[PDB]
């Protein structure tokens, strides 16, 4: 085989300083993952994925460092119709992945310089479609103030004005209110499917980033 699963992962010191904060993207939209890696000595570059819902391990798509050919595509079983890309600026290379974000394809994506054995994580992106918030039984419904990226650790949505929320029952007395970006259908008609599990594989990372506005979320220690 061209390689195996990364055995000696490493993280660049800019890994957690340059990774954009989680992003809320409307369901059914054609998101794409950008990237930019300076000219290197690594034979292979790749994009590593970890889907939030019902997934374990990692799946990676391996591109030749210079030419841009495909050497191995592990994202098959979850992204049958994803199209990659590779453009060469003599100064540095660019590669991208494109798909149709939905409930099953939200997760973390990481550019990874690669060779046969090792790897060096460089950047991370988190894609979300539904976010959990808890409301007390009688308190008025919260009202977050999502805005476009801005800068910092605030969760953001490229289309904040299409924000809509729904409630999915109770949890330890609280009422679970979920936030999502709609308008996929006309007006308020659209209502996503109720999430089938929480906390999920992405719970740890997401809850480390603040949500602008007043709202309560269970948080790590």
């Amino acid at each position: 085989f061209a390689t195996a699963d990364i055995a000696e992962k490493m993280w660049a010191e800019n890994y957690e300083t340059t990774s954009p904060a989680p992003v809320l993207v409307a369901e059914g939209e054609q998101v794409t993952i950008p990237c930019t890696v300076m000219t290197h000595s690594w034979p292979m570059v790749s994009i590593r994925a970890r889907f939030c819902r019902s997934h374990d391990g990692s799946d990676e798509l391996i591109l030749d460092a210079v030419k841009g050919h495909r050497l191995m595509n592990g994202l098959q079983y979850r992204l049958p119709y994803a199209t990659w890309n590779f453009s060469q600026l003599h100064l540095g290379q660019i590669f991208s992945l494109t798909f149709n974000v939905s409930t099953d394809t939200a997760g973390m994506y990481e550019c990874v310089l690669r060779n046969y054995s090792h790897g060096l994580i460089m950047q991370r992106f988190v894609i979300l479609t539904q976010l959990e918030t808890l409301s007390r039984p009688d308190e008025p419904c919260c009202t977050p103030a999502l805005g476009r990226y801005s800068l910092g650790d605030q969760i953001w949505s490229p289309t904040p004005w299409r924000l809509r929320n729904h409630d999915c029952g109770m949890y330890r007395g609280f009422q679970r209110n979920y936030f999502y970006i709609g308008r996929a259908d006309a007006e308020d008609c659209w209502k996503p499917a109720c999430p089938d599990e929480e906390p999920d594989r992405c719970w740890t990372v997401i809850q480390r980033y603040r949500l602008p506005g007043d709202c309560y979320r269970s948080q790590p220690h």
């Binding site: 374990d56 079983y77 007390r136 039984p137 330890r172 007395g173 906390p199 740890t204």
Partner: protein, 593 residues
Amino acid sequence: ENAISFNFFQSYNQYYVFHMPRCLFAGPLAEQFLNQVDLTETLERYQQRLNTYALVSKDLASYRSFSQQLKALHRPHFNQTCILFDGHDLLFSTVTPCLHQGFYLMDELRYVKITLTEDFFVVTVSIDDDTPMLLIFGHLPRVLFKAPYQRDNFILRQTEKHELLVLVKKTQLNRHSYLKDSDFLDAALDFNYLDLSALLRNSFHRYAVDVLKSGRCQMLDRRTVEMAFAYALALFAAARQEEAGTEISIPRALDRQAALLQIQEFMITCLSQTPPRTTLLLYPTAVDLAKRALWTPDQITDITSLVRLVYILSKQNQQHLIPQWALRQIADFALQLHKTHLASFLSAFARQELYLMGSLVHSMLVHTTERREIFIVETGLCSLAELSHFTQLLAHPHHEYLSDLYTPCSSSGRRDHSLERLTRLFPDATVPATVPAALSILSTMQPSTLETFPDLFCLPLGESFSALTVSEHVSYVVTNQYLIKGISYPVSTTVVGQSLIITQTDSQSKCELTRNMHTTHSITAALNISLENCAFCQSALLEYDDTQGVINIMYMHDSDDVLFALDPYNEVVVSSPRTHYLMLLKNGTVLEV
């Protein structure tokens, strides 16, 4: 017409065919089966794939079998679905109803996920996001594998009615070495594991006591994995306990459900950041049916059964079913216990009972008054005598059950424990070596349960502090620092540069994280206090020591309790010059004794 032809070339002149209707392949389950396997792979690739998965007899503990008699109104349904074995190598991915519940440890690189189905369950252990180890137990389907492998190299342990099948990459044995040991799960399988009552006593709590004593929680080790597997097996047994709907004596069902919920809560606190939202565990009797069948005749005449029932209802995420009078009676029982074991170590029965009450008030939002009245009592039993008796308790090896090791000092509102307070408690200058180190971790384990109080949910969980819900209207927080908004009386420094700060707030107001200096009112004093109509009832006292950590908070409910506490003959108050005694009245008054 439009059928698919299967032929085997009888001869060049003519071939024999099977005319399989295409309707049999109409369902999408055919395609999603096909896309998971590359049919172009040669035998060499299949041999290579098997070369990386460690085999039972060649790399793991050798195969061996056990045999024993496996035996002790709407039925529940798995209202949740998950994709089993997604993107796996040796197994087909399928979409089925399931009970999926994931635990995420402190370390972002580790997590354990438990999945259960109708006839078998799965345990997923993940390290550093690589391919995880899988433990599968139950009735296995005939065609689970994606290629015609020899599955007899994968069943690690076989029982009278089920078998254990293990998949793990050969590179992972440098970590999951416990597989190589022949004792793995010998204590959890080699008996009638369908006997839930004996199962919990013999297998789960056995691991729980050891893990708690050794302080291995939050770390993925052999004992924790064995615990998780035992928990999953216990859940599997519950579904097997006569779902047909045989008549059940309610107290027995209450005990069974209470044990299961205790197990789940312990694992949540031992291996998870926050509880899983899934809840709605399948039980012999639906919680609504229990409620109605037990409150139509008022069949409950025992307080213990009532507290167990309320625990079941609260943990099952059905708060709206809890009436106020039952909680009032629970609070009355709590006050009874407070009067009984005042300023002394809790008897085993008291510990076991009060464990449920302490774990209850933190899992509700209705009836804040009674919950406060119970929380204050749970905090007020943490007398230094209780700490000493707990210290002597830990050294005892005869601890069958996990409940016996409960202490109100752990999960209550006091979260400022340190080795200094523990060590200085002993005049012998000696403590059983393991205990003074283990109790620190035991009492510092994080339940993080203060969100269920409107005026305190914003209080940071890291810094040491103390909380006291003396009554409905008032709520005191004692801190080394001005943490939250409200009236804040400063007190003499424990050490120059560190101040014992007392914050008084009203429960009817939202929690606020104000760190500024304001309303820094001074401490008042009174000597010949007035007890007319017991204006001092429902008050908490604190003996602040000038040159060391604060110690030994106590809560007095009635006039008799405060009379007992004041009486120096009981050693509650000593009046030494170094230490000073303070009173926190039911209203906002803070004064010196």
